[PDB]
Symmetry: C3
Subunit: 505 residues, 3 copies
């Protein structure tokens, strides 16, 4: 179709292959041969315009569907290898993607992309901001993107919910654009401003089923964002609708298996949240160099995977996290990074003490551990490292604050000496029926049931009772002081005194 690969990096000139690519896509769609091959010629193919991958005129709504509930409009664009074929893209504006998937939502389409590189004509410096998008996905479902490279654009992968439903005059924003179920495997992004961007402007909240696996993301050192989930609030102006979770980007049930590489010099950003929620995600994440997680508002991110980093990971929150839904902003199976020191209210849990979750296997070698006992005798032991002065604590928390503000109730001590009711007085113990004994107001040792429980039996004597002014032992009943303590009283007299001698002194 007249496409040649003669891009010259030195002069930044070459043949514009956007028209040839569009003609190839249209011819592939028209004849139902839904695939276009781009061989690895002598140089890169210079492209200045967007490639729709579904043909010009397929920008939104329901695509043309056959009798089998499937979109007929689409092209599988593939090359020769991950770096064998090179596409040099010159974006007309900031949001122009080299490759896009726009149109039919709810069903599969033959649109796919593999084995090539989206890679810029103009390489913007890390100090400045770049323009262009690597791959755009709006209103598309089941669009595989496998074995591709993306380099130094404003956005590497852009999940978008932009268009509003054409039959929505009452502004519900419930029928329209939503992006779900996209497969991205073995994809590299190199120093983009936002490597992955979930954005909704006038579409639905749904971001469901999109999967990342075997991918690496190079976070830009100068304030780059590895992953962003945000709502621009464009539909807020049309309908205020002052409700917190109504206008959000709902990233739920998506897979995030990405190896992140950040910077140890200029505080790069790992995750950015702005009116969006990551709920019930999964996948294992890898981080190198220092990164920080930014949360704006009460919104949060929760995943069923785990992340590991040979680094220090920082966290910044620009508001009060919605504690009525999640304890902390960022959660995983192994760590929850927004760790805040205890507020100065609990006598034991004081300021300067920070809570950290279990980690489920004591990989840190310094935390508590759960163990079972096997062989003959059986039991369960949960243990702490030596030197832990606080010991084992039974505590409680409020709904307003989950981890900070934990109120200690019971303490068992490191040295195994005292069981202490830290926040309550008059502690005691009793049996199944409820009869028992305990303390009362720092002064009394009492039985719970009045005139029921006896001190000592003929089988189990006590051998002595020593009080401040009396002692009852083998020597007899004698006071501590001489001749000041009486036996009986003028109004409360004893009866008969049976003694062997029969005479005082």
């Amino acid at each position: 179709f007249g496409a040649v690969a003669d891009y010259n990096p030195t002069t930044k000139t070459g043949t514009d292959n956007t028209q040839a690519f569009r003609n190839a896509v249209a011819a592939a769609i028209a004849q139902n041969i839904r695939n276009v091959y781009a061989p690895g010629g002598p140089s890169a193919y210079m492209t200045t315009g967007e490639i729709n991958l579904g043909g010009e005129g397929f920008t939104g709504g329901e695509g043309s569907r056959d009798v089998w509930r499937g979109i007929t409009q689409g092209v599988h664009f593939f090359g020769d290898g991950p770096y064998s074929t090179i596409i040099a893209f010159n974006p007309p504006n900031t949001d122009a993607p080299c490759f896009s998937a726009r149109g039919g939502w709810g069903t599969h389409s033959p649109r796919a992309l593999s084995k090539l590189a989206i890679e810029p004509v103009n390489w913007a410096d890390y100090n400045a901001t770049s323009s262009g998008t690597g791959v755009l996905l709006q209103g598309c479902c089941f669009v595989p993107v496998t074995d591709v490279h993306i380099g130094r654009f404003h956005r590497g992968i852009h999940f978008w919910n932009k268009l509003q439903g054409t039959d929505d005059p009452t502004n519900t924003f419930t029928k329209g654009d939503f992006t779900e179920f996209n497969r991205i495997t073995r994809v590299r992004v190199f120093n983009c401003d936002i490597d992955v961007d979930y954005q909704v402007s006038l579409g639905n909240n749904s971001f469901h089923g999109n999967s990342f696996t075997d991918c690496m993301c190079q976070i830009n050192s100068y304030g780059g964002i590895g992953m962003r989930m945000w709502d621009d609030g464009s539909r807020n102006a049309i309908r205020p609708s002052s409700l917190p979770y109504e206008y959000i980007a709902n990233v739920y049930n998506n897979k995030h298996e990405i190896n992140w590489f950040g910077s140890d010099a200029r505080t790069c950003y790992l995750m950015h949240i702005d009116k969006a929620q990551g709920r019930g995600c999964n996948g294992d994440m890898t981080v190198e160099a220092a990164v920080t997680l930014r949360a704006i508002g009460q919104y949060w991110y929760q995943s069923f995977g785990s992340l590991h980093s040979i680094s220090a990971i920082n966290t910044v929150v620009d508001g009060d996290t919605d504690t009525a839904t999640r304890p902390v902003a960022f959660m995983w199976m192994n760590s929850a990074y927004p760790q805040v020191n205890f507020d100065g209210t609990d006598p034991l849990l004081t300021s300067g003490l920070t809570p950290r979750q279990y980690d489920l296997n004591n990989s840190g070698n310094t935390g508590m551990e759960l163990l079972n006992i096997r062989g003959a005798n059986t039991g369960a032991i949960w243990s702490i490292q030596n030197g832990a002065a606080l010991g084992w604590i039974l505590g409680r928390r409020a709904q307003a604050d989950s981890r900070k503000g934990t109120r200690s109730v019971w303490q068992f001590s490191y040295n195994g000496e005292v069981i202490k009711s830290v926040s309550a007085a008059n502690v005691g113990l009793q049996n199944s029926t409820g009869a028992g004994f305990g303390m009362l107001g720092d002064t009394l040792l009492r039985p719970y049931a009045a005139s029921t429980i006896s001190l000592g039996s003929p089988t189990y004597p006590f051998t002595r009772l020593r009080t401040t002014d009396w002692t009852v032992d083998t020597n007899g009943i004698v006071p501590v002081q001489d001749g000041i303590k009486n036996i009986g009283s003028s109004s409360l007299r004893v009866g008969t005194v049976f003694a062997a001698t029969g005479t005082i002194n």
Copy 2:
């Protein structure tokens, strides 16, 4: 080979390409060029018969093996894309697959399939039952199925162990058909009656190593089963062998990473178990809309992954689950759905109370949480939300019933006031040597060792002893009533009384 793509959906007529496909497969096998290409012509290829992918006559047993322990019989059938090439399949009967992998077990074969769609000529209504199979896999190992679509068949993926060993006259069912180690990536199934079906009739129990990743399953609303594992009991008739786990489908060490979409109207089914066991599986599962898990008998399913759903998930069990092996029928890292309320036996754990596992990170924001203390002082705290009246309980369970029937032993109370032996009386405490003090039968406070432990010391007095009829304090030793209580007895007399006065009254 005479194959054309001219299927007409309106009239449901076209050229039958099953013979051309079979001829292409045979020619590929004969010349050892083990690949057949199906381009995306103007329409779908109409197929009426089964494609063996290993040639006609390769239905079971050991395949032809070279000097390198590998099957020589096989074809890699690939097209142009996930939806670029369309195959319209007309099943002769219910169990006829459009594509199959039958034959050699235990080693690899060049059989593979990718980039196409198994998609029906006759679209059965969701009310009625469909006929045909998308992909059949029996007695095959290492058959990759990548980037394919399957639509509205009786079965989408059918793992089968059908044929019995030809050299098995004593009916052991230990040598013969078993399916293991199959790779299924980026595969869609659309409203099939059973999306994935593990079935064994006269073969071995082995279903090992089969992996699902980056796949979505659309569960049929009208009683569709997303995943089924079942034995039809055909070998039970030949040899009764009344043993529970001998004749089962053993789905072990398989990967199940599937995004499920169900229905909120007509109770679709997620997993069905009928004389089969899922043991030591893994993978993360996604569910949307309401689904229910059905378990028939004592059989169970256990996985090392987790599943998440924005929905309510129901569970039905048609018998007593085998508690001697697993606590509940369905288990995961984050949830175990067969949650049954406590039986009305424990005084604390009463009916209307349901147990739920830890969830390992308190993602529900309402459960207990494990925490470590960091910085200077160190300790461990496991805490509960405010309002939990039952507090922290130490309980025990029987082997017959794991979670229901838990017997409470110790209670520590929410308000930090009493340590209660819920199911036992005569509670107490003692030191390392075993000497100590406690209760005895709701009436006695006793030391464990007779005539050993003394009440009070000169260093630590008690200042008073108040009984029902006596009190010993600074005022002296005086009774509660006047002139009825005696000092000594006629048979048990005191000795000498040393008093400063020397005269009564």
Copy 3:
């Protein structure tokens, strides 16, 4: 390029296609068409020399990089299918690979390999040692290896850090060869001596981001190693530098999702560690038949995944594991296999008792379990199976030994009768202010604060005090023996005795 596929297994003769393959690779590199196609001819292609996949002369250092931070030297070598194309490799020596990736580190290269088999001309017996390498990867990043087979070589996959930096005269070994970020999907290895080998000789410690997924490894029965991570100590001779973790193979943040099949007869090896550390890995592992994990020295392996096996897994350690970093040598989310019986020091935790971690869901049906209570009343219960005589124990551990050597501090008993300070005497309890009561030296029952806490109140009497020689009850104050016990003393006299009678006896 003159390559033909006419290998004869019977005579082990054929045309040597190594020169044709090298010429094809060079021609592909020169014209920037970075892909070479190997169709599935009548037989296997006989190769006697190494294929560089980057051209002859590309053995290390930084590769030729364009203006876009990427290597221009490379070839994507692909065939027709996993077993459609066969390469019969005759290794000149032990370390000769059929396919290799040598050269530029830190950036991506167009080097890739897919859809073929590395498979030997000379099949060595399982008794003897084989020679050759399937795929070698040194100083290469982002080299995908998908859908390939490897058979009976000395090494299947060899990650290597061999070459030292040419500008390193002071022998720091910090600048030079390191292998990171390699993708290996759907790859089979059949009875190799070492299926996967991480080795560093004169390069950096970095082994980061390499991922294994959907792969199976057949461990050789006669002492085969499924996975090895080791340093040969070649740089130790140049610079002694007697530091433990300086010269190691750092396998960190790598994905290990491999289904292992071992042997139940001749003790095959699963993992071998020799001056290397696996830190922060992930992935789910499958094992069949008996395997053993070997650890040499203080080095360890830690992963964020889980492994399952229908077998018994053994563990051998050839030294004292570095407990200052990890508790045990091998750790996972579900198990930690180096389980050693308790040392004979704790009175409760005696020899013959072995600790095992929680497993997070009680999948073993025999261990303790964490549960939440839902519906109206709320609480938390952690429970043990019936018959566990040891009950619930609060214990502590030293840094030198994590699990063995755990010291029991508190016991709560199975029968809910005694709270025992196992390793300490003089146990007691007190309220928030610290005033309370307890034991002291097996003999005394004392209040913590002197002359503060009183025994009994007018509201809560005790009805009796029974000592060895006295009893105070409704009958009065009477001794246990007749006429030997006195009221008062010669030096410590009582005052006035108020009695109704006025006469002794």
